[PDB]
Each structure stands twice: as structure tokens, then as C-alpha cells.
Amino acid sequence: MNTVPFTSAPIEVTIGIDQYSFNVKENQPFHGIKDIPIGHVHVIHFQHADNSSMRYGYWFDCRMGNFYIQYDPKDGLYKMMEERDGAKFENIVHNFKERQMMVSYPKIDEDDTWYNLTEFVQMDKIRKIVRKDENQFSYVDSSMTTVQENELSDPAHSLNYTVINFKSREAIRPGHEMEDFLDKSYYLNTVMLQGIFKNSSNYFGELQFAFLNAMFFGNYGSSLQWHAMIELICSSATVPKHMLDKLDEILYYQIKTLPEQYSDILLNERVWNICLYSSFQKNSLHNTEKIMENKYPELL
Amino acid sequence: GAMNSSNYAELFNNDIKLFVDDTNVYRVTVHKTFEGNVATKAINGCIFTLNPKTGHLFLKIIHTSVWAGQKRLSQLAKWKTAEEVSALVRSLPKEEQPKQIIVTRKAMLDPLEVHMLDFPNIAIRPTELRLPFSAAMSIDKLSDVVMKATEPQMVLFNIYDDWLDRISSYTAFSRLTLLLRALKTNEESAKMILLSDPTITIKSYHLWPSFTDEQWITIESQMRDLILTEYGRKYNV
Numbered sequence: 001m002n003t004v005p006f007t008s009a010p011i012e013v014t015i016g017i018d019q020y021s022f023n024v025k026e027n028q029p030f031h032g033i034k035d036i037p038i039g040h041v042h043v044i045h046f047q048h049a050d051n052s053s054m055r056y057g058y059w060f061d062c063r064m065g066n067f068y069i070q071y072d073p074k075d076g077l078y079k080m081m082e083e084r085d086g087a088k089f090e091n092i093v094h095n096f097k098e099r100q101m102m103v104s105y106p107k108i109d110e111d112d113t114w115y116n117l118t119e120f121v122q123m124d125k126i127r128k129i130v131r132k133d134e135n136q137f138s139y140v141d142s143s144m145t146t147v148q149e150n151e152l153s154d155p156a157h158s159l160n161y162t163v164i165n166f167k168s169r170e171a172i173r174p175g176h177e178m179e180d181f182l183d184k185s186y187y188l189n190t191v192m193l194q195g196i197f198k199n200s201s202n203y204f205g206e207l208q209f210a211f212l213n214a215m216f217f218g219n220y221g222s223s224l225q226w227h228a229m230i231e232l233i234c235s236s237a238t239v240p241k242h243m244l245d246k247l248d249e250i251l252y253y254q255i256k257t258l259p260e261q262y263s264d265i266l267l268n269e270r271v272w273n274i275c276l277y278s279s280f281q282k283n284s285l286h287n288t289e290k291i292m293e294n295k296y297p298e299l300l
Numbered sequence: 301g302a303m304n305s306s307n308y309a310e311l312f313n314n315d316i317k318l319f320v321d322d323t324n325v326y327r328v329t330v331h332k333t334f335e336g337n338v339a340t341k342a343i344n345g346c347i348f349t350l351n352p353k354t355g356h357l358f359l360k361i362i363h364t365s366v367w368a369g370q371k372r373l374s375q376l377a378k379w380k381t382a383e384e385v386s387a388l389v390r391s392l393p394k395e396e397q398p399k400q401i402i403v404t405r406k407a408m409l410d411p412l413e414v415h416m417l418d419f420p421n422i423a424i425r426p427t428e429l430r431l432p433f434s435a436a437m438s439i440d441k442l443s444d445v446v447m448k449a450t451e452p453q454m455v456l457f458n459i460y461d462d463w464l465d466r467i468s469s470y471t472a473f474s475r476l477t478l479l480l481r482a483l484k485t486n487e488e489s490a491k492m493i494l495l496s497d498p499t500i501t502i503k504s505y506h507l508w509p510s511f512t513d514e515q516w517i518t519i520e521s522q523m524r525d526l527i528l529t530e531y532g533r534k535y536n537v
């Protein structure tokens with residue numbers, strides 16, 4: 001069980017750690033989060049009480065180093081930092097735990113929610129979507145744009161999600177215009193799965209990361225990407241059977257975890273109605289269809 | 301964006317453009333089967349592809365053999381239309397290719413867009429105008445060449461005959477849409493108006509009668525009256 005100590009909390013801020021969140025007061029003696037489960041990526045995230053705009057945060061994996069948070073009064077944000085000196089870091093944490101100045105990652109044992117949301121998400125894949133190679137962790141925020149959004153302006157600050165575009169030469173084989181447009185299977189299976197992602201785990205990983213950035217940061221381009229990756233599968237007539245079953249589980253937990261009061265903006269009416277009710281896979285998402293009907297029947 | 305009453309003069313500027321109407325591509329007669337069910341029988345159709353500036357008409361005849369053994373024909377007809385329009389553009393020299401293609405029915409946008417991916421600089425536009433191009437098959441010589449076809453065929457016409465020698469493109473397009481609107485609203489009466497006089501004939505190389513300028517005024521007025529009469533019936537007003 002790993003720990004992310006905080007130097008201090010000089011400004012009042014709501015701190016999230018995965019799907020949990022805590023309110024910390026200005027100069028409250030808060031010095032970090034302990035008992036973080038090993039084996040999964042995690043995200044720590046922030047929303048300042050005084051500017052509820054720019055949710056921001058850091059994706060990390062404690063297996064990859066010792067990470068701590070420190071507030072920067074010049075740039076005005078809580079920053080993640082890697083500590084290279086293990087004895088320093090262990091001594092700092094030891095002290096902080098003894099003074100009981102850390103909150104505990106509040107995981108219920110029966111609960112697989114975080115695993116279910118991050119099953120296919122790897123740090124190494126995150127770091128290719130978010131390019132800042134001098135760090136082992138990845139910063140994301142509300143305002144960052146995606147490469148696709150950019151094409152339609154600062155490249156070093158972009159979300160390099162895989163570009164999906166149903167009316168592109170990449171998606172449409174010459175001579176199979178109608179076929180490929182009405183059945184996206186060649187674009188899913190050959191172009192995307194066999195060519196770019198190499199396997200369905202990496203595809204689901206990026207789908208899951210996109211959803212999490214949409215939920216935690218309100219990142220709109222990530223929400224576009226999540227929906228595009230769902231639509232590409234549902235709009236294919238030929239999908240490996242293990243993928244459809246996995247997809248139904250993935251989306252179920254995503255819909256389960258979404259704040260009830262955010263359905264209006266995080267859920268695209270067109271995509272969901274097409275996926276659950278009109279697409280080839282309209283009958284392959286029983287768990288997702290059932291939770292969506294009982295929780296958000298208005299959207300549909 | 302969409303073409304409407306606001307930007308109507310753009311049709312007659314010097315940027316090459318084409319209207320594409322797919323209404324008459326997939327044509328059927330619905331009928332009863334021996335067992336009392338209903339069946340369709342297809343007849344030959346056509347794509348109506350028209351340069352409104354010059355009157356050049358590219359009439360691609362769609363022979364019933366193209367539907368043989370195919371399902372969802374109304375959907376296929378849109379993609380066949382798009383395929384043939386794309387083939388037509390590819391066949392034109394670069395300086396003759398359109399800068400814009402305006403589809404009369406919005407359902408043609410995605411099929412034509414996908415078929416035109418190799419031409420990213422050609423804008424595919426819908427229109428808000430309710431154009432009467434479905435009535436193209438009320439033009440006898442167009443209807444005749446479509447029904448007589450035994451294979452896929454492209455036939456070239458100038459839908460304005462020689463009118464551009466005396467009038468502008470704007471005026472010629474307005475006359476065309478008036479004639480077609482009249483034929484669409486009451487074909488029998490419109491044809492009566494056009495051929496009533498046996499001394500006014502259609503040139504072998506034309507589609508419409510050889511009216512003098514003053515007879516065109518009379519004809520045009522008769523067409524507007526026919527359209528108003530029909531409209532008072534339609535709505536009882």
C-alpha cells in the first residue's frame with residue numbers, strides 16, 4: 001500500500017483520488033493520502049474552491065516511483081513531483097503517518113469499482129496519449145484539447161488519442177464506400193484493432209482513459225473520444241464475441257459511476273440511442289442497456 | 301452551407317456547380333401478386349445532374365438490371381447515385397470539374413460525401429429550396445430515352461435549348477423551374493399549354509418548343525395561372 005505525501009495545503013481545494021474526494025481547508029494540516037492500492041493506475045485531482053474552473057490532476061502508478069504533491073504559489077497549482085531519494089521519501093512518509101496527518105484511500109473490500117474502470121488502462125499507454133517524457137506521471141485538465149480537435153493549437157499540451165473519423169479515407173476502402181460506411185467492421189478490425197491498437201485490450205484501455213478524463217475533468221474532447229470508440233464497435237457487424245461481452249461490462253461500470261447530475265453533458269443522446277437501439281450490437285449490451293434505462297430513461 | 305433564397309444568385313456565378321437530383325433513380329410500380337400480396341416492379345430511372353449556369357444536363361440512365369438481386373433498394377439508390385456522380389466528376393477534365401455539388405435531397409449528403417473523399421476541395425451542399433426536378437420525366441424526350449434504354453447509358457442535353465442566346469442564366473433557370481413546377485403540379489394541363497398550338501414545334505435537337513420571346517411571355521403566364529389554380533384547389537383558398 002503506497003503513499004503520496006503532500007508538502008502542505010495552502011489553498012482551499014477539493015482533492016480527488018480516483019472516485020473519492022475530500023474537501024481541504026486553506027492551510028489545513030493535510031499531508032497526503034496513504035493506503036493506495038498497488039496494481040492499478042490512479043489519478044489525484046484538484047478543484048480550487050476559489051476558481052471552480054480548471055479541474056486538473058495527475059495519473060500515476062506507485063510502482064513506477066515515489067510521488068509527492070507540492071503547491072506552487074507562482075503557477076498557482078498543486079504539482080506532482082517524483083522524489084529520487086527513497087530513504088528521504090520513506091522518512092518523510094513515516095513521520096507523516098505517525099502524526100496521523102494523512103487520509104486513507106477509502107476502499108471497501110467488496111468493491112471492484114476502480115478495477116472495473118481501469119481494467120485495461122496502463123500507465124505506459126497513458127504516457128503516449130499525454131506526452132511529457134521527463135515525468136513518470138501525466139497531467140490532464142479540463143481545457144486540454146485532443147489532436148483531432150486541433151486539426152479541425154499548442155501541440156505539446158494535447159491529448160493524443162487515436163483519431164477516429166467515419167468519413168475519412170482511413171475508414172472507407174475505395175470501392176467499398178457503402179459497405180464500409182454502413183458496416184464499420186473493416187475499420188474496427190483491420191485498421192484499428194489489427195493495425196493501430198494491435199489488440200482489444202489497448203483499445204479498451206484508451207476508451208476507459210477517455211471516459212475517466214471526461215468524468216473527472218469535464219474534458220470535452222475526451223468525451224468525444226469515448227463516444228467515438230463506443231460507436232465504432234456498435235456500428236460494426238463483425239466484432240469478436242469476447243469484445244462485446246467485455247464492452248458491456250466496461251460501459252456498465254462507467255454508467256454506474258457517472259454522477260447522476262452530469263448525464264446531460266457527458267452522455268451523447270445520438271450515440272447511445274443508436275448503440276443500444278439501432279446498431280448491429282443493439283442486442284449485445286444487456287447490462288449497459290438495463291442500467292441506462294433505469295438510471296437515464298430521459299436521455300433515451 | 302445550405303443553399304437558399306438568400307444566396308440564389310450564387311447559382312449563376314462563374315464557379316462551376318452541379319445540382320444532383322436522385323428522385324427518379326429508383327422507380328417502381330406497386331402491384332398485386334396472384335396470391336393477393338403486393339409487389340413492386342422496377343422501371344428504368346435516371347440521375348438528373350444539371351449545371352444551372354450553362355444548362356448542361358448529364359442524364360445518367362439507371363437500368364433496372366442495377367437492382368437485380370439487391371436488397372434495401374431505396375438506400376442503395378442513394379449510394380448508386382453518389383457512385384455515378386463521382387464517376388462523372390472523375391471523367392471530366394480538371395477545369396470542368398465542379399467546385400460545388402448541390403443535392404436536392406439531404407439524404408444524399410453522406411453517400412456523396414463518402415464517394416467524393418478523393419475530392420476534398422469539392423463542397424457537397426444541401427439546399428432549402430424545393431426544386432421541381434422530379435418532374436424531369438414529364439419532359440417527353442427525357443422520359444423516352446430513359447424508358448427505351450437497354451443498358452446503363454449517359455445522355456447529354458442542354459435543358460435550356462438555345463435560350464441562353466437571348467436571356468441570362470438567371471432568367472433561363474427561372475423559366476425551367478416554372479415549367480417543371482407546372483408539369484409537377486398538373487402534368488396534363490401543362491403539356492396541353494406547351495403543345496396546344498400545332499404550328500409551334502420542337503426542334504429535333506431541342507427539348508422544348510420554339511417559342512418567340514412574346515409567346516414565351518404568354519406561355520409563362522399560362523404556367524403561373526395553372527400553378528395558382530392548382531394551389532387554390534389543394535388548400536381550398
Ligand SMILES: COc1c(F)c(F)cc(C(=O)O)c1F
Pocket residue numbers: 005006007008068069070083088089092
Ligand atoms: C511532502 O514533502 C516533501 C516530500 F515528500 C518530498 F519527497 C520532497 C519534498 C521536497 O520539497 O523536497 C517535500 F517537501
